[PDB]
Amino acid sequence: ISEITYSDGTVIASISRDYLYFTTLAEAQERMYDYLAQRDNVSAKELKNEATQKFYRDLAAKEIENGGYKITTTIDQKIHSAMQSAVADYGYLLDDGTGRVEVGNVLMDNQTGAILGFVGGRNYQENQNNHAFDTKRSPASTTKPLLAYGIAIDQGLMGSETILSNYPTNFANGNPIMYANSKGTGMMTLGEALNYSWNIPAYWTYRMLRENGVDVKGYMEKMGYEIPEYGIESLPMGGGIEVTVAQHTNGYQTLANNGVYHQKHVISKIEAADGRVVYEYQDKPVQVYSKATATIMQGLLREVLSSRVTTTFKSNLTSLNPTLANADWIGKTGTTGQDENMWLMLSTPRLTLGGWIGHDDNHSLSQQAGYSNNSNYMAHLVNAIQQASPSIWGNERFALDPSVVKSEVLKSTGQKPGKVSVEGKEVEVTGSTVTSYWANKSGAPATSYRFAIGGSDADYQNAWSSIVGSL
Amino acid sequence: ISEITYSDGTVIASISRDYLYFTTLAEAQERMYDYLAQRDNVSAKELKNEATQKFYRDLAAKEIENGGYKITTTIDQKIHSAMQSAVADYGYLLDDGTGRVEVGNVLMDNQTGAILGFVGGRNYQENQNNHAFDTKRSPASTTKPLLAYGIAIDQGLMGSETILSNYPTNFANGNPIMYANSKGTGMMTLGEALNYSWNIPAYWTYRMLRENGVDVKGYMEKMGYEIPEYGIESLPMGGGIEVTVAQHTNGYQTLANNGVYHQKHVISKIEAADGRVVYEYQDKPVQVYSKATATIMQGLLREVLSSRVTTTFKSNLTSLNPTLANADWIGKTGTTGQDENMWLMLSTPRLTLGGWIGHDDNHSLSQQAGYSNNSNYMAHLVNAIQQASPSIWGNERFALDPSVVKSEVLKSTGQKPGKVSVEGKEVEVTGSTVTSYWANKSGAPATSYRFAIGGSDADYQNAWSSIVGSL
Numbered sequence A, B: 001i002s003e004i005t006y007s008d009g010t011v012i013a014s015i016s017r018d019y020l021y022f023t024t025l026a027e028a029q030e031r032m033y034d035y036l037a038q039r040d041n042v043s044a045k046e047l048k049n050e051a052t053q054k055f056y057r058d059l060a061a062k063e064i065e066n067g068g069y070k071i072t073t074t075i076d077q078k079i080h081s082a083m084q085s086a087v088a089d090y091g092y093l094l095d096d097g098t099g100r101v102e103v104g105n106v107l108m109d110n111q112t113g114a115i116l117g118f119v120g121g122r123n124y125q126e127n128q129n130n131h132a133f134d135t136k137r138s139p140a141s142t143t144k145p146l147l148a149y150g151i152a153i154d155q156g157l158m159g160s161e162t163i164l165s166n167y168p169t170n171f172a173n174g175n176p177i178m179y180a181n182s183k184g185t186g187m188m189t190l191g192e193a194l195n196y197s198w199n200i201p202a203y204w205t206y207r208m209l210r211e212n213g214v215d216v217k218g219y220m221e222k223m224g225y226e227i228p229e230y231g232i233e234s235l236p237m238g239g240g241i242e243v244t245v246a247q248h249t250n251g252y253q254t255l256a257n258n259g260v261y262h263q264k265h266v267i268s269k270i271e272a273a274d275g276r277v278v279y280e281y282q283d284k285p286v287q288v289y290s291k292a293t294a295t296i297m298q299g300l301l302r303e304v305l306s307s308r309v310t311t312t313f314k315s316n317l318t319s320l321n322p323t324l325a326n327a328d329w330i331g332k333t334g335t336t337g338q339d340e341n342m343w344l345m346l347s348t349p350r351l352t353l354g355g356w357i358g359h360d361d362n363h364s365l366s367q368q369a370g371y372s373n374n375s376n377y378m379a380h381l382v383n384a385i386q387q388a389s390p391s392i393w394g395n396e397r398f399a400l401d402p403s404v405v406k407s408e409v410l411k412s413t414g415q416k417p418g419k420v421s422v423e424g425k426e427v428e429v430t431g432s433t434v435t436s437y438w439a440n441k442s443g444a445p446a447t448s449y450r451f452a453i454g455g456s457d458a459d460y461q462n463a464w465s466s467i468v469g470s471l
């Protein structure tokens, strides 16, 4: 008899009608397929043959059914159970008057990539689609820390207080870049761009990456994302990207773990009855962002939750368990164009928890499904996890790496004090200031005219005009 | 033996070391004083004599100590107990790193004025000051629905979508009218003024009341407020006003009960051992605001909580008890100038709950004490009350009175479409629109130049300029 086990050896089942069974069985069959094909000396060339693939997939399945294999998962029994009870008890809180709302969640150890528990859906018995591991949806604005701002910072093209343009602007086709029914405002710090999840600042950031020839694909692929076309305007808003929750959880794991990626996994070992190791997870850690970059981003995402602008999460959690709400949470929300998908990604230094909600047919959620319902659900979910394993979230704080450089910049320009040229009259540029965190060697540049990320000639006119009137 | 009883006859004590005992004993002694002086045929003239007052106060005290009087309070035993356990368990949630934070609360039946339970402080054993009944503090922005907007509406001087100026302006002494460290913005609806609790719009509103000779003192005194000087610029921000929580609770009771005041009371009856009724609460209901006015205000204060701008309350409550959070809550927050006092006033159609926090020495709280800590505490408190008396909050909805008049106005001007004069060029005034609720007979006026409440000639220039550019 083959058994699937929790991470401490306790048996999950013999080879039973929920997500856990089918998800861990599927992954194991995949690992068995690879072992068996290698064992039988099947070249990767012969492995291309579709009749051969089919035979080896069935072999792997039967090999488990019949054999005496021990399959060690990463799953934590108390944690995963709590997470199931949570979704059964509180999942109704997702329903926002747009029909039954589906959900997927993945809880991941930041230092290993191991998956400690997950939520595949509202109720396997009614809908078997696995929303943690199978369904792919746009990650929307949760793309921005990874693909736009994180890389800009890591490339030394901006720092924690750099200014960006949220002035009105169009896609190449001439259409307005929208954020909800807003069409934009004026300049703003990275903090505000992130806390509000504005779109124009993300657009301009990714334009600057393109203009500088930055290898964005390299960052993304190091974390296991497959994106077919990087040449998309709305890429940093999640356009052209579809991800599972497990995959996307792994990106935020990278940020949380000070820039070091660990590949997600639910299977840790497969052994034959006699001990022969058939499969074993091999950890391959990769420094995707510099320690400076990640710790600076950690500090921005702390205020994304604190500010409470796009999510009620900290309020919800404070009420349920104020001691847990005092742990060091950082996070980012996301919303697709027709309120089709909502994400909330949460981390402590120890764990990351990814969450998505939506409909299987892709129809719209209510305007507040992400801001409110999913934040509240996730608060309950995080509470449930803590009560099942009191120390699992940890009490450690995120902190800036020593390698972080700190420059005093002007609040107004996000840049160092200096002279600068505004039609005629070149200005001494005074005003109040702040400490900006950079991930390069020199830190903030001297102030120059085109001070923001992005913006039109009109834009800089209005801005400097408003700025100078303030001297 | 004299007894003090809960509202169902259950005995509280014989004439024991908490707020309940001392508060109900004090009020009873006051009612005994009046009975005894009348009994002894002591004229109100002789009652002016201070030696005579002193004797009759001691007589009333001893008369209770010795006699066989039955004192019936309004207090609900389960409710009041739950409220004590709540403050003992969750009161620490008020502490915001500015020292120990004090608290007072009063729960009132909207249809009777009866006080069902209250919180006098963190812990009688450590500090005996009664913060529900004795301490008087400025009610700050919770003054605005009562004294500025409510009366403007009731006088037919504005409606639910009327525009007001939050443009920069000074007090007569030349100082900027501040809202936090902001000095103001542009025009805005009553909704936004209330949701954000901006100051300038309240200033201009109370100026308009003064300009029109409105009897403001008449509204306020009908609800039992004593305000010595109505000639104060910041009156609608709570300047020149100090109130107990019980008194201020009674004002919001008036709004909640569709404009009908019922005098607050904690004693309902005092009887001698033989049955002689010595004192009995006589209900004297008063229509302070029209039904139109109150129901229109109810609808504004629903969105003050919904919007979550000045209080996390609905988020906190949603997590603790989502079914209770679906009841029909309306409310208003307040903050004094140096973050010295925070208030949250909450109502369902059935109950009102007033809350204050602060320090006995008047020193500053943290910036977020009101927005966050007190909202969370109050959420727990409201939950505790529901669990002790499951139906007490009720499931009824606030609704507009039939007498409410409804006019289509321009979103931009808060006023009806028409022609109007802007230097030269008198405009046909187009644009998108909304339904505005008024409490007069004719509803919204035709649009005119000075369309807002308040504003300078500069102000209207910028506004109309921005408005016209939008046609």
Ligand SMILES: *[B-](O)(O)[C@@H](C)NC(=O)c1c(F)cccc1F
Residues within 6 Å of the ligand: A139, A140, A141, A142, A178, A179, A180, A197, A199, A237, A333, A334, A335, A336, A337, A338, A339
């Ligand atoms: B992001 O998911 O916060 C960002 C791309 N989302 C939006 O722009 C957005 C909203 F803010 C609101 C509704 C839909 C939508 F795509």
Ligand SMILES: *[B-](O)(O)[C@@H](C)NC(=O)c1c(F)cccc1F
Residues within 6 Å of the ligand: B139, B140, B141, B142, B178, B179, B180, B197, B199, B237, B333, B334, B335, B336, B337, B338, B339
């Ligand atoms: B009101 O209490 O909301 C209003 C009068 N309060 C304030 O203007 C205010 C703040 F908004 C913030 C800090 C102090 C203060 F008086």
Ligand SMILES: [Cl-]
Residues within 6 Å of the ligand: A018, A019, A020, A021, A084, A120
């Ligand atoms: Cl499961």
Ligand SMILES: [Cl-]
Residues within 6 Å of the ligand: A018, A019, A020, A022, A023, A120, A128, A129, A130
């Ligand atoms: Cl599955």
Ligand SMILES: [Cl-]
Residues within 6 Å of the ligand: none
């Ligand atoms: Cl075989």
Ligand SMILES: [Cl-]
Residues within 6 Å of the ligand: A006, A007, A008, A009, A010, A075, A076, A077, A078
């Ligand atoms: Cl386990």
Ligand SMILES: [Cl-]
Residues within 6 Å of the ligand: A214, A215, A216, A217, A218, A230
């Ligand atoms: Cl690329």
Ligand SMILES: [Cl-]
Residues within 6 Å of the ligand: A224, A225, A226, A227, A242, A243, A244, A247
């Ligand atoms: Cl992917």
Ligand SMILES: [Cl-]
Residues within 6 Å of the ligand: A229, A230, A231
């Ligand atoms: Cl490309």
Ligand SMILES: [Cl-]
Residues within 6 Å of the ligand: A027, A264, A265, A266, A267
């Ligand atoms: Cl795996």
Ligand SMILES: [Cl-]
Residues within 6 Å of the ligand: A068, A272, A273, A274, A275
């Ligand atoms: Cl074997």
Ligand SMILES: [Cl-]
Residues within 6 Å of the ligand: A287, A289, A290, A291, A292
């Ligand atoms: Cl590094």
Ligand SMILES: [Cl-]
Residues within 6 Å of the ligand: A305, A306, A314
């Ligand atoms: Cl917070």
Ligand SMILES: [Cl-]
Residues within 6 Å of the ligand: A359, A360, A361, A362
């Ligand atoms: Cl569906």
Ligand SMILES: [Cl-]
Residues within 6 Å of the ligand: A156, A440, A441, A442, A443
């Ligand atoms: Cl450098």
Ligand SMILES: [Cl-]
Residues within 6 Å of the ligand: B018, B019, B020, B021, B084, B120
């Ligand atoms: Cl008490």
